[PDB]
Amino acid sequence: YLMEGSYNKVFLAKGNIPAESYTFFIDILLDTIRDEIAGCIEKAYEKILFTEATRILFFNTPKKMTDYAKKRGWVLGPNNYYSFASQQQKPEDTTIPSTELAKQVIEYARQLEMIV
Amino acid sequence: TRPANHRQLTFEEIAKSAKITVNEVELLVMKALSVGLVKGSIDEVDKRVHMTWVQPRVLDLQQIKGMKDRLEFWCTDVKSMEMLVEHQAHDILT
Amino acid sequence: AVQKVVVHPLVLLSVVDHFNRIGKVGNQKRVVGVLLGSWQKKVLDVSNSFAVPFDEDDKDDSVWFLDHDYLENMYGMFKKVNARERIVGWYHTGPKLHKNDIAINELMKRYCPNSVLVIIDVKPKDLGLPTEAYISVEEVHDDGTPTSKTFEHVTSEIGAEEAEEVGVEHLLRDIKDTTVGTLSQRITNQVHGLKGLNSKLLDIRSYLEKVATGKLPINHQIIYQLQDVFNLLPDVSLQEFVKAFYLKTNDQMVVVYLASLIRSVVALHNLINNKIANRDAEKKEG
């Protein structure tokens, strides 16, 4: 269930620990999900108020959300998570082919004319 | 004055830098194209002009410093790309 | 007015042999001679030459001599042995453009109207074509003198001919990187041509040596071109110059993908023509 996107059914299994305590293990599984959602809060989302993505992990309203909202972006505003969905800087690169393909075209002429 | 990145001024800036109204700057630039002192194109709905060629002027010993330095790292760019040539196509011809 | 010059390898060799027969003076002598040839269809041709006796004392270096009797009768002989051949101008050995070569040309313009000079090389080392020629132009113009005259270089190359290509390609016998395939262009203009642009970039650096310290005349008519080179410097990679570049790469390499695919099956068929001569030959002969 951690392989696909499913997160709720993961914590339904954190409602279902049958065998022994398993306490130190699921708390690391808490922690490696906490940065994962704090990772996956950074997708193309709109304005979210301080209730919806405030309850996507577990928490009601502590200052723990300010720990996440000052770790990454989605700036603390008037009940708002600001979206810096830019993804604009990287394209229009002719040079990266123009360095790499000029290597590759010579490699075509190596195994074309000269005897090997 | 503008670099070769854009040199794309608007008619409002001409109305600012020459304090002349909007309904005459189109007549101003067609005269400039006809005499031949500038060679560019004219948009009208986005209110900009794509100036391409300008008349060459004169300059002092300070503008050669810009032409020294913009030329100078363009020297090693000819060195850098040809460095791939004689090192990768080396065994193609001794 | 003159498109280009055409120099044959005969006259190219017909200076260096004269540079050897005067090379015994040791101290100083420039090889100055008379250049013979025609010009037809606006292209300057060079065919034949000889050299005229000439001396030069270092103090008061404005006293030259051309023994014109040696200029008359020997051209009178060469016109007699070849009426097609005529005068085309003159030449000098040209290490570094000596001073008499402003009025050597004006001394002997009474024979050729466009009396062109040719600067040659005696110590061959460069990455180009060490044959220089100028042209004579004068000006009652901008700033220098009331009488102003400065030579201007017309483009220069070594022209060939069918009769001499037998002898030219016979005298080499050393190296000749023929068989123009996928790699003749790689070296005649892709190894060398990028380093061709080296010394053209480096040449304007040599003019740039006057920023505040060099020679006293500054620019006036040199910078209008240099202002244009940085202005006509090509288009940056933001437009569909990105997109139309990947367009043709997705078109030119398709033909390369087809042609390489063909080359496999051809040589595969040639493998079968060699197994037809191996298994069907061992049982017969042994």
From Swiss-Prot, chain A:
**Can you locate the Glycyl lysine isopeptide (Lys-Gly) (interchain with G-Cter in SUMO2) cross-link?**
K63
Q: Which residues form the signal peptide?
A: none
Subunit description: Component of the 19S proteasome regulatory particle complex. The 26S proteasome consists of a 20S core particle (CP) and two 19S regulatory subunits (RP). The regulatory particle is made of a lid composed of 9 subunits including PSMD8, a base containing 6 ATPases and few additional components. Interacts with DDI2. Interacts with TASOR.
What family is this?
Belongs to the proteasome subunit S14 family.
Q: What does this protein do?
A: Component of the 26S proteasome, a multiprotein complex involved in the ATP-dependent degradation of ubiquitinated proteins. This complex plays a key role in the maintenance of protein homeostasis by removing misfolded or damaged proteins, which could impair cellular functions, and by removing proteins whose functions are no longer required. Therefore, the proteasome participates in numerous cellular processes, including cell cycle progression, apoptosis, or DNA damage repair.
Q: What is this protein called?
A: 26S proteasome non-ATPase regulatory subunit 8
| Gene encoding the protein | PSMD8
Whole sequence portion shown: 235 to 350 of 350
Swiss-Prot record, chain B:
| Underlying gene | PSMD13
* Protein name per its UniProtKB record: 26S proteasome non-ATPase regulatory subunit 13
**GO terms for MF:** structural molecule activity
- State any GO CC term: nucleoplasm
What job does the chain carry out?
Component of the 26S proteasome, a multiprotein complex involved in the ATP-dependent degradation of ubiquitinated proteins. This complex plays a key role in the maintenance of protein homeostasis by removing misfolded or damaged proteins, which could impair cellular functions, and by removing proteins whose functions are no longer required. Therefore, the proteasome participates in numerous cellular processes, including cell cycle progression, apoptosis, or DNA damage repair.
| Family, as annotated | Belongs to the proteasome subunit S11 family.
Cite the record's note on assembly.
Answer: Component of the 19S proteasome regulatory particle complex. The 26S proteasome consists of a 20S core particle (CP) and two 19S regulatory subunits (RP). The regulatory particle is made of a lid composed of 9 subunits including PSMD13, a base containing 6 ATPases and few additional components.
Gene Ontology terms describing biological process: meiosis I; proteasome-mediated ubiquitin-dependent protein catabolic process; ubiquitin-dependent protein catabolic process
Chain positions with N6-acetyllysine modification: K16
UniProt entry keywords in alphabetical sequence? Acetylation, Proteasome
UniProtKB/Swiss-Prot annotation, chain C:
Annotated positions of the N6-acetyllysine modification: K200, K210
Q: Where is the MPN domain?
A: 5-140
Q: Which Gene3D superfamilies match?
A: Cytidine Deaminase, domain 2 (3.40.140.10)
Q: Where is this cross-link: Glycyl lysine isopeptide (Lys-Gly) (interchain with G-Cter in ubiquitin)?
A: K176
Q: Which UniProt keywords apply?
A: Acetylation, Isopeptide bond, Proteasome, Ubl conjugation
What SMART domains does its record include? JAB_MPN (SM00232)
Q: Which GO terms describe its biological process?
A: proteasome-mediated ubiquitin-dependent protein catabolic process
UniProt xrefs under Pfam families: JAB (PF01398), MitMem_reg (PF13012)
Q: Name one GO molecular function term.
A: protein homodimerization activity
Tell me more from the record: Does not bind a metal ion.
Protein role: Component of the 26S proteasome, a multiprotein complex involved in the ATP-dependent degradation of ubiquitinated proteins. This complex plays a key role in the maintenance of protein homeostasis by removing misfolded or damaged proteins, which could impair cellular functions, and by removing proteins whose functions are no longer required. Therefore, the proteasome participates in numerous cellular processes, including cell cycle progression, apoptosis, or DNA damage repair.
| Name this protein carries in UniProt | 26S proteasome non-ATPase regulatory subunit 7
